[model samples]
Target: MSAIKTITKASHLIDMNDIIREGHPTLRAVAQDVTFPLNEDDIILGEKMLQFLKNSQDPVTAEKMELRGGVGLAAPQLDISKRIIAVLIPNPEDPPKEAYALKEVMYNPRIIAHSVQDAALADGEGCLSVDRVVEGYVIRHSRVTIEYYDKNSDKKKLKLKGYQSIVVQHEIDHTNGIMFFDRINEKNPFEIKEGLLLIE
Candidate 1:
């Protein structure tokens, strides 16, 4: 979807500077699963997360507010310690450059199945909560079947690939107290296993 033009209706805005940095207690903590049929507060948080991510990526708004562009966010990043994740991925059906993001909100997301193939971004991965640069490749499944609860409280399963699969894996890691850099091989940070696929 296109960037959101307004977030005035949200109960409150999360300051761009408020994102918890690495080593904070909250970042290392394991997030709890959300209950079914979310409460009013969780529902509101979902809206706020979507708004923040869209606004952060909107060119005009990001430049005006000096916000960092991000594609996905998790409740743990906000210190909420909940198993909720929000993502805005480029729509695969559209032109690669002009495509709008496909917005998704997942509660208690889990990977039920995955391809044997592995993939990694050439430039490496980054985290909003990690301030310092960590150079390394975080190998991930090339495709995965994820199951989670949608905003309507309905159980849903999605087959994700390429960039979408990578982003979802990154967000799911947060709920498990695993950092992207932690997945890198300490002795060979840039090492790519044989037959590993590369994605842009």
Candidate 2:
């Protein structure tokens, strides 16, 4: 039996229906690694996920499609147990650092190393897979070094920081079968040690 779902090619371009909510079993289980010489469907899966981000980000398409804004998405969100994630992070209106846009599909992405200092979003984290907004800071490493294969199966490494770091962490958590809210402090979700970076 194959853990991976034989994805029925989506005609809606991965609309809200294609995205599974929090209760799905796949959300709690670790996804399998993607093999090289990626299957045609696996390759298409990445593009579909990436397109979902672009569509959700576009005001016109998002409203017409009734899509929620998404910066990153993991294959498991679609009930597919593959170590695949799509990141379409973008620069904010005012901008913080220089352009920190990272848009690509990553296969078998893993964090090589991470900074000791922790970070979190002031407004808290959100996910396409989660319907309820659990109010709490999702703690994550302030910076991380990651290694993954591109669609071309080319090995690539990245060092991420700031909000960008938080986004990737959220997506990576999905690959590991961990939800963003799992990292929230149970007792005091708002509490954090002094000097921890809090991104607004």
Candidate 3:
């Protein structure tokens, strides 16, 4: 049910031009449905995302993007949302270093619960849509029970714990036209401008 395609550098993270703001049509529009078991397009896009994230490891671009050293990323930042996400989980065999992996063409990954109430304990929380600012206290489930089709095309259910679960939930929100600001626990979390959040 899955097909392969050549991975290209163009599949990387949204450059300055590709990123959309609040009013952009592509940002507000709900992403198109992802094909099941994935097509050639799906695998390629997923691989591209993985490459972009891994490339960020380079010393040069690392300084320019101002990344908080995050480990997971989504596809919407490229204005294409086909239920693709990639993670660079640190290899258990090698500590304090990392390895890149792709969670190809997931169909509707969602969060079911939290192991704890503390979101600050997680390393970092970011989004493709919310570019500049990083929000603290992004109350999210520490763990999630999700069902997605695996490489074999069999429906697989997994319980993601820790940051992996949180990142998946964040991307799912975008696919539904939800923003990180909506999920903030604060009574009034507003957009920051001039180094201040104009609470409404």
- Cα-based lDDT for every prediction: 0.82, 0.87, 0.54
Per-model TM-score, in order, reads 0.89, 0.92, 0.67
Misplaced by over 4 Å in model 3 are 1-16, 60-69, 91-105, 112-124, 151-154, 186-200
How many backbone overlaps does candidate 2 show? 0
> Of the candidates numbered 1 and 2, which has the greater lDDT value?
2
Top of the candidates by lDDT:
2
- Candidate RMSDs in order: 4.8, 2.7, 7.4
Candidate 3, residues 89-134: lDDT per residue as tens digits? 5544544354433244455555554455333223335664565775
Candidate order by TM-score, highest to lowest? Answer: 2, 1, 3
Model 1, span 90-136: residue lDDT tens: 56653577565458889999999999999998888999898888988
Q: State, as a TM-score between 0 and 1, how close model 2 is to the true structure.
A: 0.92
- Write candidate 2's Cα lDDT for 1-200 as tens digits: 13233343654368888788898899999999998877877888888888889999889999999999999999989888789999998776674584438888999999999999999999998888788969998899999999999999889999999988898888988999999889999899999788788999
**Candidate structures ordered by lDDT, highest first:** 2, 1, 3
RMSD of 3: 7.4
Supply the global lDDT for candidate 1. Answer: 0.82
- TM-score of predicted structure 1: 0.89
**After TM-score superposition, what is the CA distance of residue 78 in candidate 1 from its true location, in Å?**
0.3
